[PDB]
Design a protein around this ligand. Structure first.
Ligand SMILES: [O-][O-]
Ligand SMILES: [Cu+2]
Ligand SMILES: [Cu+2]
Ligand SMILES: [Cu+2]
Ligand SMILES: [Cu+2]
Lengths: 74, 273
């Protein structure tokens, strides 16, 4: 069962997640590759060695990583 | 071909390695290694096809990737080989690894930009082209997102694990491969990527030349594991969906199998094993 959707402004940026593989995340409207691990944790392409518990946590980690920079689509 | 501990390189060998890396960048070849790696990072998944990561083939895949990259270096300067970074030993930002004559240091705190060494954006010689974060300069934050590199005692506990890998052959597995990769346990290889930060923490991690030195030491640890467990070998050994079995070929090359990569000595030796 996929996680719930989310939508918030985090550090001045809009982060959105929704079930869709399986789940999509956007940062200011640009899609961010995210992936779920077998134990239920998540990563994103800009934190791909660093599991966090939820897709929102991965989106927030991406905003932290980007330090205000636009994301490029994958 | 001898792969040496980075700490032991002469000034001449550091100069030649750097120059060879910068020429692969200039000619356009370097960035395609970054692209290949990211394509596999993004496609290797725990419940479907998985080849370069989170699977038994993590180790032979990166061994063959590093050989491709070493051969490209040697096509520029035949004397160059890939050095390795023993992060259990050279574990601070003061390691000669991070000196301006080798890889340069950590990034400045505002934007993570590396400001010295041959790969600093200001040199004009290291554009970050293959990227997700839209910034085009090499970034690092050594020790920023995780406080410590693995220790020798931690490495030794992983080395002591006798099974190469175990079902379900993914990031949930017990066994040596997944403990070395780091998704379970005290965490060796993934934590080093997180510790360097910047591009090394992302799917385009070969953007940082330390990527190669990190994976050359991971590769050395597989060789040491084999010496510790000569009765253990690569698994699985046939008929496993979505996973590369011992005698199956691996993408993207398609012409090589884990079986062809188990013995590193067919391609290189280490300064000491
Ligand atoms: O694994 O990079
Ligand atoms: Cu990799
Ligand atoms: Cu992914
Ligand atoms: Cu790696
Ligand atoms: Cu014995």
């Amino acid at each position: 069962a996929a996680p719930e959707s989310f939508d918030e402004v985090y550090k001045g940026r809009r982060i959105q997640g929704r079930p869709a593989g399986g789940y999509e995340v956007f940062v200011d409207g640009v899609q961010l590759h995210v992936m779920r691990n077998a134990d239920g944790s998540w990563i994103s392409v800009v934190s791909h060695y660093d599991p966090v518990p939820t897709p929102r946590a991965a989106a927030r980690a991406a905003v932290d990583e980007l330090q205000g920079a636009p994301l490029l689509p994958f | 071909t001898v792969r040496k501990n980075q700490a032991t390189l002469t000034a001449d060998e550091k100069r030649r390695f750097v120059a060879a890396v910068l020429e692969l960048k200039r000619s356009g070849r370097y960035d395609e290694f970054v692209r290949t790696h990211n394509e596999f990072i993004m496609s290797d998944t725990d419940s479907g096809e998985r080849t370069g990561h989170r699977s038994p083939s993590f180790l032979p895949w990166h061994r063959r990737f590093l050989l491709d990259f070493e051969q490209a270096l040697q096509s520029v300067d035949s004397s160059v080989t890939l050095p390795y970074w023993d992060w259990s030993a050279d574990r601070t930002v003061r390691a000669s690894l991070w000196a301006p004559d080798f890889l340069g240091g950590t990034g400045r705190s505002t934007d993570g930009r590396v400001m010295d060494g041959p790969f600093a954006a200001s040199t004009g010689n290291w554009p970050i082209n293959v990227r997700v974060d839209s910034r085009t300069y090499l970034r690092r934050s050594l020790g920023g997102s995780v406080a410590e590199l693995p220790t020798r005692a931690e490495v030794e506990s992983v080395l002591a694990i006798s099974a190469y890998d175990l079902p379900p052959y993914n990031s949930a597995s017990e066994g040596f491969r997944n403990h070395l990769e780091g998704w379970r346990g005290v965490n060796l290889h993934n934590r080093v990527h997180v510790w360097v930060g910047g591009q090394m923490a992302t799917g385009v991690s070969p953007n940082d030349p330390v990527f190669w030195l990190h994976h050359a030491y991971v590769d050395k640890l597989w060789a040491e594991w084999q010496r510790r467990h000569p009765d253990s070998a690569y698994v699985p050994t046939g008929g496993t969906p979505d996973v590369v079995d011992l005698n199956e070929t691996m993408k993207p090359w398609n012409t090589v199998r884990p079986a062809d990569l188990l013995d590193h000595t067919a391609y290189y030796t280490f300064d000491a094993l």
